[PDB]
Design an enzyme around this catalytic site. Sequence first.
Site, PDB file in Angstrom:
ATOM      1  N   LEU L  38       1.018  -1.372  -0.144  1.00  0.00           N
ATOM      2  CA  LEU L  38      -0.088  -0.057  -0.004  1.00  0.00           C
ATOM      3  C   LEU L  38       1.019   1.240   0.177  1.00  0.00           C
ATOM      4  O   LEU L  38       0.530   2.416  -0.573  1.00  0.00           O
ATOM      5  CB  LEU L  38      -0.984  -0.073   1.164  1.00  0.00           C
ATOM      6  CG  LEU L  38      -2.337   0.664   1.118  1.00  0.00           C
ATOM      7  CD1 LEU L  38      -3.281   0.503   2.250  1.00  0.00           C
ATOM      8  CD2 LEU L  38      -2.220   2.001   0.389  1.00  0.00           C
ATOM      9  N   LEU L  40       2.569   4.352  -0.312  1.00  0.00           N
ATOM     10  CA  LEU L  40       2.181   5.078   0.906  1.00  0.00           C
ATOM     11  C   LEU L  40       0.783   5.298   0.801  1.00  0.00           C
ATOM     12  O   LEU L  40      -0.077   4.692  -0.001  1.00  0.00           O
ATOM     13  CB  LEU L  40       2.893   6.442   1.065  1.00  0.00           C
ATOM     14  CG  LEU L  40       4.260   6.651   1.515  1.00  0.00           C
ATOM     15  CD1 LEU L  40       4.301   8.187   1.571  1.00  0.00           C
ATOM     16  CD2 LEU L  40       4.649   6.094   2.748  1.00  0.00           C
ATOM     17  N   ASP L  41       0.031   6.062   1.974  1.00  0.00           N
ATOM     18  CA  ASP L  41      -1.240   6.354   1.902  1.00  0.00           C
ATOM     19  C   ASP L  41      -1.891   6.455   0.511  1.00  0.00           C
ATOM     20  O   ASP L  41      -2.902   5.794   0.244  1.00  0.00           O
ATOM     21  CB  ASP L  41      -1.602   7.449   2.856  1.00  0.00           C
ATOM     22  CG  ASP L  41      -3.098   7.498   3.149  1.00  0.00           C
ATOM     23  OD1 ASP L  41      -3.881   6.844   2.786  1.00  0.00           O
ATOM     24  OD2 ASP L  41      -3.384   8.441   3.911  1.00  0.00           O
ATOM     25  N   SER L  42      -1.400   7.305  -0.225  1.00  0.00           N
ATOM     26  CA  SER L  42      -1.757   7.568  -1.672  1.00  0.00           C
ATOM     27  C   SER L  42      -0.735   7.064  -2.502  1.00  0.00           C
ATOM     28  O   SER L  42       0.466   6.309  -2.058  1.00  0.00           O
ATOM     29  CB  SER L  42      -1.900   8.874  -2.008  1.00  0.00           C
ATOM     30  OG  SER L  42      -0.629   9.786  -1.959  1.00  0.00           O
TER      31      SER L  42
END
Lengths: 167, 57, 458, 101, 173, 52, 114, 84, 152, 141, 107, 86
Positions: L38, L40-42
């Site tokens: 994943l 990063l977060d985005s």
Amino acid sequence: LTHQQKVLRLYKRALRHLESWCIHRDKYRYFACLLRARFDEHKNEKDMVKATQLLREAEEEFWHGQHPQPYIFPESPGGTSYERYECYKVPEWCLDDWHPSEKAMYPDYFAKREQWKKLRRESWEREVKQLQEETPVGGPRTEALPPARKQGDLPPLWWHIVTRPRE
Amino acid sequence: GGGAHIEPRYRQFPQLTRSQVIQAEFFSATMWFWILWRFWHDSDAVLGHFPYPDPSQ
Amino acid sequence: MLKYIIPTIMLMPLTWLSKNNMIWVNSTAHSLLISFTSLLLMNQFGDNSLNFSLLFFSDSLSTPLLILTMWLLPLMLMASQHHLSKENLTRKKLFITMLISLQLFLIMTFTAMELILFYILFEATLVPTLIIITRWGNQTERLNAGLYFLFYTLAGSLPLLVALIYIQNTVGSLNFLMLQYWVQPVHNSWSNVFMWLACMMAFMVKMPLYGLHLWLPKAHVEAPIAGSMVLAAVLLKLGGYGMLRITLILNPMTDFMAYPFIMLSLWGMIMTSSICLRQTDLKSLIAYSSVSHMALVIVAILIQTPWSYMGATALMIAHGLTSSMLFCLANSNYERIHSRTMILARGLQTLLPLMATWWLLASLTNLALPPTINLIGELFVVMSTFSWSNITIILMGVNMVITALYSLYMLIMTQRGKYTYHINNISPSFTRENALMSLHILPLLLLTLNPKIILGPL
Amino acid sequence: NAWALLMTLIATSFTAIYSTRIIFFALLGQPRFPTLVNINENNPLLINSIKRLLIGSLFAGYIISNNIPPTTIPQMTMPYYLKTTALIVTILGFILALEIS
Amino acid sequence: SWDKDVYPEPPRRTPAPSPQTSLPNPITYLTKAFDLLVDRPVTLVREFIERQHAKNKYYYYHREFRRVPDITECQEKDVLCMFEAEMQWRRDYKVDQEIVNIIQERLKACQQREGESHRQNCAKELEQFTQVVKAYQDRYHDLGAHYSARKCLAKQKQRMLAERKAAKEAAAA
Amino acid sequence: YRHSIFAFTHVLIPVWIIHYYLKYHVTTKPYTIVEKKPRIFPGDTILETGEV
Amino acid sequence: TTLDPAEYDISSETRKAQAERLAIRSRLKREYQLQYYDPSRRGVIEDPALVRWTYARSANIYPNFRPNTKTSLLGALFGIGPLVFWYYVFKTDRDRKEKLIQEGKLDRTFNISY
Amino acid sequence: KNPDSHGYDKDPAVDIWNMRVVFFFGFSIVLVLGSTFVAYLPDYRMQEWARREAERLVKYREAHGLPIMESNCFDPSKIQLPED
Amino acid sequence: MNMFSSLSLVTLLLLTMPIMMMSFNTYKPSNYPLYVKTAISYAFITSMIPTMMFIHSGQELIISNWHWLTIQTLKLSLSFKMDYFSMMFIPVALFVTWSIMEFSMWYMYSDPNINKFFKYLLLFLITMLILVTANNLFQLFIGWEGVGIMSF
Amino acid sequence: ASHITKDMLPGPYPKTPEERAAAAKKYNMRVEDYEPYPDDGTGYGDYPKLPDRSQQERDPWYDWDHPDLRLNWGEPMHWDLDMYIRNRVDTSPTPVNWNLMCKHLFGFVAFMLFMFWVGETYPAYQPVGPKQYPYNNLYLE
Amino acid sequence: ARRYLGDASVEPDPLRMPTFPPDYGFPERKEREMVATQQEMNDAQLVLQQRDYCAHYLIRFLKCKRDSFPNFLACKHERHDWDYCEHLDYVKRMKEFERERRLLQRK
Amino acid sequence: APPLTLEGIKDRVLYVLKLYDKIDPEKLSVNSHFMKDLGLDSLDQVEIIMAMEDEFGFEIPDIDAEKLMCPQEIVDYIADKKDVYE
């Protein structure tokens, strides 16, 4: 919408309106990292007003540079031949009014239908009354316990579970 | 179902029927042959030329 | 003549005299038959009109108009059957009697031989209609439709009997129309306006001007089961023709004041059709059509100069059917879904496929495609009323636009996906649904083949 | 009107870029569109249709025109610079078609 | 057919043939063909009944009325005598419509009979036609009383204006 | 192969009926179909005479 | 032009105490589907917002009306006004056209209709 | 109203009678048998009579001396014409 | 010349046969389109014949047929017009539509309502075809709006 | 057969919190700014207390918008405010309030003057004065 | 428009020509230029602006056109020479901007 | 009419996800849980659906982003959209 994910809805569309501007398939691809550079310029810093200028000034420079007639992905919220096929729409529960001699056909299928109903004939006594136990007073989004704790039948039966297909 | 008669493409660039294109190409002549008689025989203008009506006498 | 009133009154004890449920089919069977008699001796002249008795010339007049009147009766019992099957037989015997008790006078009227049989029979209804509205209503607002239906119709039709008894003893005898062969004119005074105004305004309050129509949607919105008498009340209204018997003569030469009835209904014709677009109740939506291209005749009649009567007659019986039949659709689709709110019914046209072409041919005859009667009834209006003054082409040219957005928006509202919550609406239009909805479009378009049978003398 | 002359003949130009645009994005550039494309053009109930028109296209204009009783007098004396002035524009249309493409 | 002088037309002037040429003409492979697939199923049947119809001959006569009733008699208030004085006048306004029909179609036979000239020929119909209708709406057209047709009460009272004004008030005449 | 009367039941029924309504007809109407003039050219009674 | 229509505005964080704007609606779609899913129904649903949609629109105004504010005496600028105008337009014609029909003849003599 | 009966108007029998009593009485005996009546029904408004008689009488005048479409005010000097 | 007009109407009466014979003619089954598609083919060669008849002798025609109502003076019946715009165009407008339905025949090939598609494509051609042929100004207006509804 | 208090009664201030929401919840808390207020310019009987108006405008927008249905199809239980113009109206365009069309529609109006002249090709302009002569000027022969 | 006198027959769409309609004419060259016979001009079917010069010539053009029916070409030299009649006429009518140019200048 | 199955969608999704050199093609395919991938977060979740739209091409709804934890979950409901396997 939680402040965290608010860039996504922009981050989804940002490159979206881009590609309908570019022509060559590499053009979109070549500007990817190059315009991707601007996002993480400040990668880790405040969630509040400090970085809200990453939200604040994102408004302009986007709407400015908007509407080059985007690619609409034809079957979708808009654009040509999206909702096109309604001439079927599958009016589920068309099986009521017949006057058999129209019911001679698909005998195996008429057998199967009345077998589905037994679930919905009585699943209720613990299906409905559990919703009187499940939601104490004002409950938000209304689905039951995901299993319904032993066997959901369906429970959402059958309107969402048997619903209409596309052809 | 209906039949397998042609399989699709993963961008391996599907093959033609080999009577598909030749039977068409004979109609690439009908523009290039029927363009024959343009300059033969006709010029950019087949007209006659206005001879500057000098006799104002 | 008695060829007609006698069997149709003979109908009257064909009904109760019968047994149990055989009653409906008993009278519907006969009531059709009379239509052979209807044509039978009628559709004679033509020239030098038919008068077969002292106080009756049935219809000669080239206002045949009577054949329809005898249609709509055994279109009711096919129409009215739906929820009237739920109360007692001695009451069901009534509702068929008074309904006939109407049909007997509409044969008396349209003949009348004269003025003064017309009037007492022109007011002789409202006994049978008022009783059908108040009983067998639906909502409780009906009780006011009872009054408003009077207190207009009767309100100003008393000044007739002050005027028509004023003529009877002034010039000779009004006993007969067919003798006007002595008529002096009406020049002017402050008395004669009133005479002309008394001999007129009673008729206007029936076929509405844009004023004093305040009753028309009050009675139709809330009104009996099937439109059972709502089909009849779309005959009653147009039957204000008698203005064709008067204004042709009997004060011919005052056109002086015509203008407040022209510019008042000529700017309403462009008007009340436009206040019909946002309606949320369907039996309202049709009720305002009925004003509009009915109220166009009032600018056809006042102007003299035929080519209007060529076109004014075709209109009285133009919407006589189309405007009838729509109240027959909106009834049916209401049987199944018990709101009259237009929104609620959507997502049809999948579930009742055969009834698709029924809406269409109806909503197509307000559009008035050229070949049918409708335009050939409008394009003799525009041809004379143009010569009046060239500028009439604009407003009544606008009428031909807003009416097209008008009609479609009613159909195209029933083409959508809606499955939505309805478990009702199963019945796939059992025959009566599509049988009584026919016997309109079949006879209607048909007349265009030999359309010299709908015309005035001019 | 001495405007339409200005106005119309300019429209004649775009008659090139009308064409060449929908030619050059569809018939020219590299293939771009998602995979699994099944295309089959071997279609007796189609090829039968086009073949009739294009044949009945090329010969058409001359057959129709060649047979008429003449109804009017065209000028037929057309000086220079009034002559191919349409073709003169399209010539650079294609130029500005591809150069701008 | 019809009555010749009721519907006169100019003669045929059939065009002369001009083969001039060595090439085949297809019409001669059609008029020689089409004729042979027509006459047999067609002309034999019309001859078939027209003799089949020799078995019976009906009659329907030519209806001509009896004109005593005059015009401007009689004593004013009357009914019986002025009932008929319209029946004279009403039929004779149904005639004068149609005599405009017949004379109008005769006009069309001045055009598509010719249609190229449309101008230097016919000599008659148009220059006559607008001398006809101008003999129509005057005195034979009760206007704007045409709605009532105002028979014989207004029919003369144009023609009183066509008397009490013209020929005397004309000043000086 | 035949399938030779289907084109006959198609066209050959009308072509009969339609003309039976004409041959018995054109001379019935006082002025029916209006067909135009021959447009005669100086190939009959005339000399040219030019050619000039 | 019609309209901005304000697809962004101020927010964040004020009025995050505003919640249970959904609890208002979430109650019903729970109850509505509690209505809408049942084995034996066969019929339409009350849907009060529609009952209060017409009945607070068609009727229930002349009851609510008062003839007071001169923005409700406005209508004289609307209802009667142009109806006088159309008289002013016509009555001049039908006359201007009439005067000429007497002195001088505008028409031709091949006009019988009318 | 469907216990899998077919049905049109009301119940078991005369419903079946009630369909033939509308369809057959309603049309094929009226919309057809009657419609035939006025189709070829005799001359309507005495126009058929008029065509010929407004045909014959054209040439009668045109033949000898007489004009066409007089409008002479029906034989004047039958009228004294009040002046003033 | 006797066959001159009579063959035109053939083009006209024919296309009504594909309609009348939709209601208990003992209809041709699916490939009902082919029933029409051939019902076209013979219409074009039918119209091809009179084209040549005109480009020889001229001689355009109309027809007097059938008296609709006759009011006061003007008498409207109906007619057709063979004129120069009639002789050439009409063969064309049929010639394309000869080739067009085959395409749809492949394009619409999977639609269960195809059978009544070719009906609401058929009237369109019919009534658009009576606009070009009518010399009676009213008659121009029957097909003028007859097509304007077909769009809907 | 809804019994008592079907619709709006004589507002638009009859204890604003009593209405929304007694029944007919336009506002939750009696102030959502959906309180049965918007009787703007009253004395017009139009729109009495009305668990109702001026709630905003330009469309239900008919997109994914998928809690269940939420806009024009699928009918959420009760929001209804005003309607019936909503099936022929949408939202914000890309530009704002530029009338350049009245500019372009008048763009040719520049060439009105190009109408008062002619286009006669032969001969050229050739600045003249009294050389014009459309037909004739001086003597015939 | 040479002879401006009256018209015995009034038939307009100038079935009354001045004598034969020219384009303008004469004025001097050609004083009487001479066209074709009017009795045969509208005896055939001849449209207006077919009554200009080269009527005699173009009446023959269609003569052969009617001769070979199954043919796409009759005379491409005559149709060429149809300019040589018309082009010669039109160019002879290009001279009216030459005279008026220098005639209406100084003297 | 074009035949569709549940294998290719396990392959195609496995395919381009194995095409990206940012992912080693020894890594899990059907279940990695994607929270390991994943980062990063985005730039993952919305990043991965940028390409997968380029092949099927329907709209990739917003609120369906949070279903993308399970690599079997993405392939899971794409069957329910286009009317896929029995």
